[PDB]
Structure 1
Amino acid sequence: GAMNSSNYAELFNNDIKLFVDDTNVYRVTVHKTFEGNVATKAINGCIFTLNPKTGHLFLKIIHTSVWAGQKRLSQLAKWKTAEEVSALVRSLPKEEQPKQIIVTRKAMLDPLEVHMLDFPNIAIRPTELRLPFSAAMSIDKLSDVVMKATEPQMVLFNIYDDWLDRISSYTAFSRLTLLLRALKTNEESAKMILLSDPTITIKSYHLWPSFTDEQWITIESQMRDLILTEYGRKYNV
């Protein structure tokens, strides 16, 4: 059933699974019209489909042309997400297909279940974890490829860079979710932390800076401080 703190280590076992997050599929700017009414303008979005064991990220870019002439776009976005995830699964060799797909929002359950009827043995699961994957568009290289897209496109990344050479997937996921939680709570501060020291660079083939083990401990501490701070600045404590 639902994925929660009690069954957290299941994410790092050897059953292939994918998280699917749809919070950046349908994105808009809200603006005034010449007549003083309000209107929306869509911008490019993305499906965030992530293997938490390996770090493999299947970033399906959603070009604004998919919304042209369509009604009820927030509803359509969930079904478009499920269509694209189903298409991804069918494109993978059988031995690479997931045994479970975990959706970060319960409104994705029925759309994905219906699109995956051909795969009765793939479990579609919700989660009680409040995962910060909406902040994926605060990762500069991901935001860049989404905004530059002129057509539908899939781009493959490893969201852990080379971390798995040195740490376990449990630890890599915890670092990732800490980084993304920070970026979600105070993007400016989080990005300052990550890039304050000009001698640490991001490799061309990476998403995050090339921190040593000791520097990651400092970085991770600074992100916890930020999250706690903002939690005070917010609630005043």
Structure 2
Amino acid sequence: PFQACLKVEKFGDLILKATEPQMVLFNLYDDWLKTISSYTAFSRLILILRALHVNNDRAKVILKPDKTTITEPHHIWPTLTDEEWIKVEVQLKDLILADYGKKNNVNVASLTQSEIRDIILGME
């Protein structure tokens, strides 16, 4: 879901405000690579994008739970700790799976681990 990445306020605003064709850079991992591996940060990324793609604002509820949670200007996503990251990850997996099963009328406690991994990661 690289498309939903432009649902973020910053990107869409930037593009809509842009007066000339121009190349811009960003780091979607922020400072994550300090505490984690690349690929794992990649999984966290896919979780975030997909989750923004399904319920949108509700994923923003997960990502902006407490007003005491802040995001720094250098970074795309709020500053969180590893415990906090595992929790919000579980919540995002919950968003994606719940809505998929709600569309396909499937009891989503009955899906497999392979099925869940597929659904989250992409097309099965």
Q: TM-score, normalised by structure 2?
A: 0.81
Aligned residues: 106
The structure whose residues are more often strand, as a share, is: 1
1:139 to partner: Cα distance: 2.0
Q: 2:23 aligns to what SS in structure 1? A: strand
1:217 to partner: Cα distance: 0.6
Runs of 5+ consecutive residues of structure 2 not aligned to the other structure: 107-124
* Residue 147 of structure 1 pairs with residue 22 of structure 2: no
Deviations 1:150-205 (A, max 9, x none): 11121111110100001000101000011111111111211111112111111011
Q: How many Å separate the matches in 2 of 1:200 and 1:216?
A: 13
Q: 2:24 aligns to what SS in structure 1? A: strand
Give 1:235's aligned residue.
104
Percentage identity across paired residues of the two chains:
58
Q: How many Å separate the matches in 1 of 2:49 and 2:67?
A: 21
Q: 1:222 aligns to what SS in structure 2? A: helix
1:136 to partner: Cα distance: 1.0
Runs of 5+ consecutive residues of structure 1 not aligned to the other structure: 1-131
Give 1:175's aligned residue.
44
Q: TM-score, normalised by structure 1?
A: 0.43
Show the 5 A alignment for 1:192-207.
Answer: 192-207=61-76
- Bigger Cα Rg: 1
Give 1:126's aligned residue.
none
Q: How many Å separate the matches in 2 of 1:143 and 1:161?
A: 19
Aligned Cα RMSD in Å?
Answer: 1.0
The structure whose residues are more often helix, as a share, is: 2
Q: 2:25 aligns to what SS in structure 1? A: strand
The structure 1 segments of at least 4 consecutive aligned residues displaced by more than 3 Å after TM superposition are: none
Greater length-normalized contact order (CA 8 Å, ≥ 6 residues apart)? 2
